[PDB]
């Protein structure tokens, strides 16, 4: 009171000093039950993977993909995310995903990277330097390699030109090394571009088969459809908390409501565009939002001359959240009042309070 | 499998008064016993809409489609710009079991229709992007509103048991939202699909324009009345 009044003495009366508001306690988030998980089981755990020059292409769109489970998987020898960080891939996402799956030797895994050239990197598959996405590779000696000779796997060895980024070549034309034409039969200057692999269970490290899948994320102006889930949590009631219900943020206390939403609305507002009720995405029930209480504070004093004991009034605040004990606490139509006694007599009004009641000094 | 017929499907292109039909919920916000003014695309009151008793018609901003359907002859819709594989084509069919929605570069014939003894009106189906299957949409009146904004296709629908003879009845009924599509296409024309057996089809078409409307919400949150503000001075 002395601070606001800027004096060392205070005249008898009632003064307004400051405000008071209930602080939020914790935060909660709500999100639907999730659905349409992305099918990585039939891609990464596929029984058969095609050749390097004929890599299998898979389109991923309109599903939800959890990157944490594959990030924590230790069954993959190499997991390199170049365009984006692997941890934040669950949040950021693109409009579609393209998966290129194939099998190569262990020594050829380094060629599958931006800014890399080689036999595989130029004759079978080419990766652009501006590529964004991830590459996941793991050994498949126990599966792809064959005791009798894994000749089913082939790699392109001969071509006049290189490969375009994200270009697949399946032509089996007899390459002509020299200037001597060949009538479909390989000769001195003609050889088969495709060479069969020689994978065996025991063939040395580096020569063993390795399954490599490259995921490229594209963000064409079409809406994004595939990325990580939103982690929901439980809800509380009768507590001033902040919330982000399905992207709609607000602070207040949440109670049960009897309003009957029609089966397709999500939230309601009464007038002047203020949200009142929301529908939780999981339980599908209508709640009610009320801003948690606030109001001004005031001090009643009998004057510095007479004494120096005061009373405190909180305006329009229920006598439930005062903080703190002081003296007996009175609840009045004007708010709550601490530090004064209530009597059944009736005198004249000295320091008006409100709602037909006021206080004086005798104690106060 | 698709060949042209002998007789032309010359349906009489007459005109009929729109009265007060073609009002839908503009959002998903609940409001109780309140009057709200909103500016959006709508079908102006008492307009003259086209009546057919199967050419290619422009899409424009939006389309209001109505069918006084008996025994479910109307089956689907086709949307696109070039109506071939050179541009994305949207196909919707409600067959006997479920609705199928496709977004592919099809190759349609001159006069596609469903045919009975599935889909053979397209000679090719390549580069498919979006597929969808859901519950079927369908002496009844079937009303639909088709809109396309910033790569989003909105379909609203309403079914009504009607007993009037010829034209749209004098009554009010809001259109609830039905389906949304997060696909980006620039459709400019469309078509109607009939399952005509190898051996008298009437519907109503109207267009949409931007304007302001006033809507009334009752206590339960249902739209019960509306007023067009770009009309006679009393309404304004
Ligand atoms: C979201 O998932 C929860 C979890 O299953 C669903 O809650 C279930 O609702 C049924 C319906 O009575 C109960 O029998 C189960 O006991 C509930 N599971 C619980 C409480 O863990 C909820 O219905 C789902 N919401 C949807 C699908 O909209
Ligand atoms: C301050 O809050 C308390 C607690 O919510 C209110 O007490 C409730 O009042 C209602 C209305 O009569 C009763 O139905 C409840 O049974 C009461 N609960 C308890 C625990 O007593 C109190 O009414 C509020 N103050 C004012 C002025 O309304
Ligand atoms: C109506 O269309 C649905 C949707 O395509 C058909 O249901 C599918 O039919 C195919 C071929 O019979 C099956 O391979 C799918 O498994 C079916 N899907 C579902 C969800 O049932 C249905 O057969 C069509 N009916 C008619 C009469 O044409
Ligand atoms: C056939 O599909 C391919 C991709 O599956 C389309 O290629 C896209 O073409 C657009 C045109 O500018 C590019 O912006 C995209 O980057 C391309 N790749 C995508 C979307 O992955 C091709 O356009 C399709 N063919 C037709 C006729 O639409
Ligand atoms: C709004 O909702 C209320 C509550 O459901 C409806 O009131 C019901 O009306 C039916 C038939 O008119 C009665 O059989 C019920 O007993 C009523 N229930 C209650 C709680 O009143 C009301 O009809 C709905 N429509 C309007 C315009 O109020
Ligand atoms: C492949 O199968 C193993 C064994 O069940 C599993 O741990 C792994 O998550 C699966 N990977 C994918 C991509 O489904
Ligand atoms: C209070 O006021 C009286 C005059 O009414 C004065 O005599 C007295 O000294 C004052 N006491 C103080 C200022 O403490
Ligand atoms: C009188 O005051 C006392 C305490 O001051 C209170 O308990 C009581 O309810 C009041 N009224 C009557 C009729 O005693
Ligand atoms: C019918 O439509 C025509 C448009 O060609 C219009 O000029 C005419 O006024 C309409 N008739 C009405 C509204 O009664
Ligand atoms: C549709 O064509 C218009 C023609 O200018 C173009 O601006 C627009 O980007 C196209 N949209 C799609 C989705 O093809």
Residues whose CB falls within 8 Å of the CB of residue B152, separated by 6 or more in sequence, listed in order: A223, B180, B181, B182, B183
Q: Which helix (H) or strand (E) holds B226?
A: strand B223-228
**Does A274 lie at the interface with B, CB-CB under 8 angstroms?**
no
Please, which experimental method was used? cryo-EM
- Tell me how far apart the alpha carbons of residues A160 and A177 are, in angstroms, rounded to a whole number: 9
Q: Per this entry, what is the length of chain B?
A: 236
Which residues 194-223 of chain A have a CB within 8 Å of chain B?
A: 221-223
**What is the Rg, in whole angstroms, of the alpha carbon atoms belonging to chain B?**
19
Are B107 and B1 contacting, i.e. CB atoms less than 8 angstroms apart?
no
Q: Residue B180's CB: how many other CB atoms inside 10 A?
A: 11
The DSSP line for A163-191 is --BT--------EE-SS---SSS--TTEE
Q: Which of B34, B124, B195 is nearest to A269 (CA)?
A: B34
- Tell me how far apart the alpha carbons of residues B171 and B148 are, in angstroms, rounded to a whole number: 27
CA trace torsion A249, A251, A254, A260 (10° rounding): -40
Question: Is residue A47 classed as helix, strand or coil in its secondary structure?
Answer: coil
Q: Residue B28's CB: how many other CB atoms inside 10 A?
A: 14
Which domains does chain B show, CATH number per domain? 13-236 (2.60.120.960)
The sheet with strand B14-17 has its strands ordered as: B14-17, B48-52, B203-207, B62-69, B140-149, B152-161, B174-181, B23-24
Backbone phi, psi, residue A67, to 5°: -85, -15
Are A24 and A240 contacting, i.e. CB atoms less than 8 angstroms apart?
yes
> Longest C-alpha distance within chain A, in Å?
125
Q: Residue A331's CB: how many other CB atoms inside 10 A?
A: 13
Residue A61 distance to chain B (closest CA, Å) = 9
Are B137 and B16 contacting, i.e. CB atoms less than 8 angstroms apart?
no
Residues whose CB falls within 8 Å of the CB of residue B133, separated by 6 or more in sequence, listed in order: B98, B99, B100, B101
Are B205 and B99 contacting, i.e. CB atoms less than 8 angstroms apart?
no
**Does A19 lie at the interface with B, CB-CB under 8 angstroms?**
no
The DSSP line for A134-159 is EEEEEE-TTTT--TT-BTT-EEE---
Q: Which two tokens stand for residue A233?
A: 């949590």
Write down the residue that tokens 């459709």 correspond to: B187
Pairing of strands A267-269, B29-30: parallel
Ligand 5 lining (C-beta closer than 6 Å): B 218-220
- Tell me how far apart the alpha carbons of residues B24 and B178 are, in angstroms, rounded to a whole number: 11
- Residue B30 burial (C-beta neighbours within 10 Å; 0-12, 13-18, 19+): buried
Q: Residue B103's CB: how many other CB atoms inside 10 A?
A: 22
Pairing of strands A63-64, A226-227: parallel
Would you give the DSSP letter of residue A286? B
Torsion over CA: A240, A246, A249, A250 (sign): negative
Residue B34 distance to chain A (closest CA, Å) = 8
- Tell me how far apart the alpha carbons of residues B52 and B10 are, in angstroms, rounded to a whole number: 9
Q: Which of A163, A161, A158 is nearest to A173 (CA)?
A: A158
Backbone phi, psi, residue A5, to 5°: -75, -20
Residues whose CB falls within 8 Å of the CB of residue B115, separated by 6 or more in sequence, listed in order: B1, B2, B121, B195
Can you say how many angstroms the Cα of residue A340 is from the centroid of all Cα atoms in its chain? 53
- Tell me how far apart the alpha carbons of residues A31 and A229 are, in angstroms, rounded to a whole number: 9
Q: Which of A99, A158, A102 is nearest to A125 (CA)?
A: A102
Are B106 and B122 contacting, i.e. CB atoms less than 8 angstroms apart?
yes
Contact B184 A260 (CB under 8 A): no
- Tell me how far apart the alpha carbons of residues A68 and A45 are, in angstroms, rounded to a whole number: 17
Strand partners, B132: B101
Contact B182 A225 (CB under 8 A): yes
Residues whose CB falls within 8 Å of the CB of residue B175, separated by 6 or more in sequence, listed in order: B22, B23, B24, B25, B143, B145, B156, B157, B158
Q: Which of A350, A309, A321, A312 is nearest to A17 (CA)?
A: A312
A221 lines ligand 4 (CB under 6 A): no
Q: Which two tokens stand for residue B234?
A: 């009393």
Q: Which of B175, B181, B10 is nearest to B91 (CA)?
A: B181
The sheet with strand B89-94 has its strands ordered as: B57-58, B189-194, B74-80, B89-94, B99-108, B122-134
Per residue in B152-178, is it b (16+ CB within 10 Å) or e — as a string? ebbbbbbeeeeeeeeebeeeebbbebb
Pocket residue to mutate for ligand 9, from B48, B204, B207, most atoms within 8 A of Cβ:
B48
């Amino acid at each position: 009171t002395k601070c606001t009044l800027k004096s060392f003495t205070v005249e008898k009366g009632i003064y307004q000093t400051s405000n008071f508001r209930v602080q939020p306690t914790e935060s909660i988030v709500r999100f639907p039950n999730i659905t349409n998980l992305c099918p990585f089981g039939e891609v990464f755990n596929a029984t058969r993977f095609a050749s390097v020059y004929a890599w299998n292409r898979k389109r991923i769109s309109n599903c939800v993909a959890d990157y944490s489970v594959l990030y924590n998987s230790a069954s993959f020898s190499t997991f390199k995310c170049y365009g984006v960080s692997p941890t934040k891939l669950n949040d950021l996402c693109f409009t579609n995903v393209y998966a290129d799956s194939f099998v190569i030797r262990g020594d050829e895994v380094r060629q599958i990277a931006p800014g890399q050239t080689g036999k595989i990197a130029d004759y079978n598959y080419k990766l652009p330097d501006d590529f964004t996405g991830c590459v996941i590779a793991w050994n498949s000696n126990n599966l792809d390699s064959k005791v009798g000779g894994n000749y089913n796997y082939r790699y392109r060895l001969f071509r006049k030109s290189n490969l375009k980024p994200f270009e697949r070549d399946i032509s089996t034309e007899i390459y002509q090394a020299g200037s001597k034409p060949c009538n479909g039969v390989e000769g001195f200057n003609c050889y088969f571009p495709l060479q069969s692999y020689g994978f065996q269970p025991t063939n040395g490290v580096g020569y063993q088969p390795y399954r490599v899948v490259v995921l490229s994320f594209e963000l064409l102006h079409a809406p994004a459809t595939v990325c990580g889930p939103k982690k929901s949590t439980n809800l509380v009631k009768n507590k001033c908390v902040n919330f982000n219900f399905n992207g709609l943020t607000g602070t207040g206390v949440l109670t049960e409501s009897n309003k009957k939403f029609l089966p397709f609305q999500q939230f309601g507002r009464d007038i002047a565009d203020t949200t009142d009720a929301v529908r939780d995405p999981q339980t599908l029930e209508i709640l009610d939002i009320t801003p948690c209480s606030f109001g001004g504070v005031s001090v009643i004093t009998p004057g510095t001359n007479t004494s120096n004991q005061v009373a405190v009034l909180y305006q329009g605040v229920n006598c439930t959240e005062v903080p703190s004990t002081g003296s007996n606490v009175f609840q009045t139509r004007a708010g709550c009042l601490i530090g004064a006694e209530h009597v059944n007599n009736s005198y004249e009004c000295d320091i008006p309070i409100g709602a037909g009641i006021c206080a004086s000094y005798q104690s106060i | 499998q698709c060949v042209n017929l002998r007789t032309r499907t010359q349906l009489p292109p007459a005109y009929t008064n729109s009265f007060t039909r073609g009002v839908y919920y503009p959002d998903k916000v609940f409001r109780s016993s309140v009057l709200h003014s909103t500016q959006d695309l709508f079908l102006p009151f008492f307009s003259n809409v086209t009546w057919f008793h199967n050419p290619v018609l422009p899409f424009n901003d939006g389309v209001y489609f109505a069918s006084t359907e008996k025994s479910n002859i109307i089956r689907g819709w086709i949307f696109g710009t070039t109506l071939d594989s050179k541009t994305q084509s949207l196909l919707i069919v409600n067959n006997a079991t479920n609705v199928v929605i496709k977004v592919c570069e099809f190759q349609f014939c001159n006069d596609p229709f469903l045919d009975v003894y599935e889909s053979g009106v397209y000679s090719s189906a390549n580069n498919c992007t979006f597929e969808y299957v859901s519950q079927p949409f369908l002496k009844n009146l079937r009303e639909f509103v088709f809109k396309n904004i910033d790569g989003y296709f909105k379909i609203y629908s309403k079914h009504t048991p009607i007993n009037l003879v010829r034209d749209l009845p004098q009554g009010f009924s809001a259109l609830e939202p039905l389906v949304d599509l997060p696909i980006g296409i620039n459709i400019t024309r469309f078509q109607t699909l009939l399952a005509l057996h190898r051996s008298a089809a009437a519907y109503y078409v109207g267009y949409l324009q931007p304007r302001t409307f006033l809507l009334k919400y009752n206590e339960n949150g249902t739209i019960t009345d509306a007023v067009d503000c770009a009309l006679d001075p009393l309404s304004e």
